[PDB]
DNA sequence: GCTGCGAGATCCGCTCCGGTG
DNA sequence: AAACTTGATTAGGGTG
DNA sequence: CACCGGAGCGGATCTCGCAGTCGACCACCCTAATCAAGTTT
DNA sequence: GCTGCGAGATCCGCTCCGGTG
């Protein structure tokens, strides 16, 4: 989606949204949108698969609650203790369920336990322990646990197994519970991943960096070659590149590109 | 009718009237009537604040539910200015209900009366509900932050105001590419549809009812209320089950 | 889509409840203490929270054919088919999925202190790192299918409407007074289709002359 | 009926954007808003999956 | 064809504006008083008299990229492509063009009074007397290319039928979906010629990954 | 004709038939692979 | 590089229901 | 001796 | 031999003139010319 | 005791004559 991208930064420098809203509106690959926000100083002046996990005690049952930061999608499972190693098991299985890119958490032992961090490295996750400072995520996560314990309190009498009812709250909140036009956080996530796929098959050429020389036309008259600059988003018959002059993404048809091998 | 089947589900799982509407495609005023009537869990609904930004008294409106907003820059927080503001505010919408606090122009008798002229629910009280209050706060903070982005870009302040408004209402999106405006439009769709399809028709009526066993008519049962009269059917609570039921009008005796 | 199959499997005295999706081939597994009904009720609750099944196959074994299990598949609202699994298309994939399951367990389990971390490893290899065809993995197929469901849903929900405008088409000359109501057969950019009632005649109608309407 | 000319302006605005209702007893507001629901891109974009044939 | 390249070159304090045809290898050159835009405008008016350019390459030099030089290219309706010279396909030809040129100049300039006479000599050697393949000169390749570009050649193609085709693309042998349908641009043997809609690229498709579409009846 | 690899030239190839000219590039058979190619006009020498 | 349709009173073409030689 | 150049403020023409 | 096309005539449809005969004033946006002050050769 | 009609240019339909497999 070469065309959408310059146009989307153009919208953003004006209107200063989430990278979300640009990705969704303009139908681009999102990480370009995230780049625009990171390349929009204004939204860096004022400030997918990203999670936060907080152990929570309900009725003397340690509940390890993963909270996805964007969709509001959540996971949890009853955990025996706050041990590092049990949490290592839980994040191995949980990493088998999800495709987490990144994580927030506090400094509690299992998260800062060294081989846990070595294991988050072993799976290729960015783990950030720290006193979480962000009301963006912390409102979501606080609210998440309030709704969690309240809805557990609704559901647990209906089931023999507290694990079955824990699954109950997971069902009601991630599936049954919806918003807006019918958005469960699950289906939000499903969308996030499916749209991550199609960029992802483009990402394999993107992770390797190319540079190019590039030019543009005036009344069809080609200007001189410009760059060397990175090949930012590969299109069909074109790419995207940034104008170093205007600080703006720009489409260049492959004819008006020379890739720098 | 999906409405009694949705009710059968909420009596089990107890979701949000949000998610009951969304799941079942039932009305949200229906769905809200469920959550109000479900003892387990026991729209067009807004809130106002005034606030100052750069010594600019600015009226605010924030929908409670879609989250979508309106505001206007204001000369003073007085009654009559507000009265015209809510004339127009009403005018841009079809508001059913509101929350606000006890402030003078809000609680003001001609202004309250004026709600009654509009025939609308006004509630002043120290707003207690963290559901609303966080969203209100996010609105103000986000908003004046977005002014702080945008207002240098504009000759006019209230142009820039329109700008921040656009950002939050529209250009911002969440979920599936839902700005709150998307949400609201969808809400008003099925809600005006249920409203037109249901509310103005008939109110406060009882009936006798039966159910069919292999098509064999049951005894006439009740008397109970007709909760939502449908097209060719109704909605009724069987008293024994504590569950709502679609009943076909042929199996109804409307009690006059 | 979202049609699954369960089988119990024993990998070195560790009972493992093996959920197998039929189309995408995306798999789930979790370690099991016993094959009893109640434990499977917990597992299919959690699993129904993690995966959003329509439907299921399995054998006739006690936990599945157990009463409150079945009642719980209805309370969760899944189609549960118990019976002698007869289908080569399924049972080929079920069998090979078990074969590759214990294959890759036997690969990864030395590498991991906990066995559930290891079986989690195998789930990762097959669900995710395994790639075939043009290079899509199973979880990509599955996520794509879940999305495709909702695509069907919304696409329907706009099909459901059948809107009718008013228009001003032909009749002598220039522009006439408003006409219809006739329903939107097809949307254009700047135009649509209608029928002409009088002539029964479909028409290419520019939205310059079109007013759009709910029939009711 | 009003203190304000412009509240009366609101009143006219109200009425004809709403209270004027006709044909099937619908405002313009009905139709705009309805069509915004029908102006939606996704259901609108979703339909691509449906088959094409060509024809002569 | 008619895709040319220029590079100025100095040979013994004589600027030589060396036209290079990117296909035939035919060239034009002349001794030039200065690399100025204006003199170059005159040179390319003469040259557009002696040749019929569609298109051009050159470097970004001042004469070429000059505004009224560009306006002159458009006044003549020629495609002017200025750039960092980045191609070894054509820059091989241009490199050995100037090397061979200075070689032949160094041969002939004693043999004639004027350097313009001898420079013309080099043009004669390399355009006319230079022969290759079956004995075709590069000037012969140019005339042949020009002679074969005729719109009476367009006429016959316009008379013909077209048939249409779906097509697919194999990746590691994994066939893509049928696509389009599209024109058969040309019937091949075991293949045909089409264009990609998506990439706007001429493509060959194997006749099995062609489905030849039936005509009306 | 000749081909590129990362832009870098292959040697001249052919002679092979002039089969279908397009805009900017043509069609030849690759005699090596028994499969047709397309070659930029600048990348061709006709005979 | 753009186009008179809309608000306001009247009246014929039809149907549903009631009276009766 | 002459010339050449720039910031604000008034005279005409086209839309409500 | 039925369907379609071309030329001529009839029925239907939209816009405007006769109501005397036409021109000032306010406000905003766009285009253009001259005085006081500052440079050189 | 007084009331809007007619001229201009298009657009569609009907009739007579001629061409097509």
UniProtKB/Swiss-Prot annotation, chain A:
<feature type="binding site">
    <location>
        <position position="54"/>
    </location>
    <ligand>
        <name>Mg(2+) 3</name>
    </ligand>
</feature>
<feature type="binding site">
    <location>
        <position position="16"/>
    </location>
    <ligand>
        <name>Zn(2+)</name>
    </ligand>
</feature>
<feature type="binding site">
    <location>
        <position position="106"/>
    </location>
    <ligand>
        <name>Mg(2+) 3</name>
    </ligand>
</feature>
<feature type="domain" description="Integrase catalytic">
    <location>
        <begin position="45"/>
        <end position="193"/>
    </location>
</feature>
<feature type="zinc finger region" description="Integrase-type">
    <location>
        <begin position="3"/>
        <end position="44"/>
    </location>
</feature>
<feature type="binding site">
    <location>
        <position position="40"/>
    </location>
    <ligand>
        <name>Zn(2+)</name>
    </ligand>
</feature>
<comment type="function">
    <text>Catalyzes viral DNA integration into the host chromosome, by performing a series of DNA cutting and joining reactions.</text>
</comment>
<protein>
    <recommendedName>
        <fullName>Integrase</fullName>
    </recommendedName>
</protein>
<comment type="subunit">
    <text>Homotetramer; further associates as a homohexadecamer.</text>
</comment>
<feature type="binding site">
    <location>
        <position position="43"/>
    </location>
    <ligand>
        <name>Zn(2+)</name>
    </ligand>
</feature>
<feature type="DNA-binding region" description="Integrase-type">
    <location>
        <begin position="210"/>
        <end position="261"/>
    </location>
</feature>
<feature type="binding site">
    <location>
        <position position="142"/>
    </location>
    <ligand>
        <name>Mg(2+) 3</name>
    </ligand>
</feature>
<feature type="binding site">
    <location>
        <position position="12"/>
    </location>
    <ligand>
        <name>Zn(2+)</name>
    </ligand>
</feature>
């Amino acid at each position: 989606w070469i065309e959408n991208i310059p146009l989307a930064e153009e919208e953003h420098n004006k209107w200063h949204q989430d990278a979300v809203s640009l990705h969704l509106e303009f139908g681009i690959p999102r990480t370009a949108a995230e780049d625009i926000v990171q390349q929009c100083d204004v939204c860096q002046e004022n400030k997918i698969d990203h999670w936060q996990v907080d152990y929570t005690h309900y009725e003397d049952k340690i509940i390890l609650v993963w909270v996805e930061t964007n969709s509001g999608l959540i996971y949890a499972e009853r955990v025996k203790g706050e041990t590092g190693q049990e949490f290592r098991v839980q994040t191995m299985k949980w990493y088998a369920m999800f495709a987490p890119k990144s994580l927030q958490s506090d400094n509690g032992p299992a998260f800062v336990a060294e081989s846990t961090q070595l294991l988050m490295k072993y799976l290729g996750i960015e783990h950030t322990t720290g006193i979480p400072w962000n009301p963006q995520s912390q409102a979501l996560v606080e609210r998440t646990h309030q709704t969690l314990k309240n809805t557990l309190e609704k559901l647990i009498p209906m089931f023999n197994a507290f694990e079955s009812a824990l699954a109950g709250t997971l069902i009601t909140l991630n599936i049954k519970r919806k918003g807006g036009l019918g958005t469960s956080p699950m289906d939000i996530f499903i969308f996030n991943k499916e749209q991550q796929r199609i960029q992802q098959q483009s990402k394999s050429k993107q992770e390797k960096i190319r540079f190019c020389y590039y030019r543009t036309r005036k009344r069809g008259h080609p200007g001189e070659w410009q760059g060397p600059t990175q090949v930012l988003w590969g299109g069909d018959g074109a790419i995207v590149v940034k104008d170093r002059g205007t600080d703006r993404y720009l489409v260049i048809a492959n004819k008006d590109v020379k890739f720098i091998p």
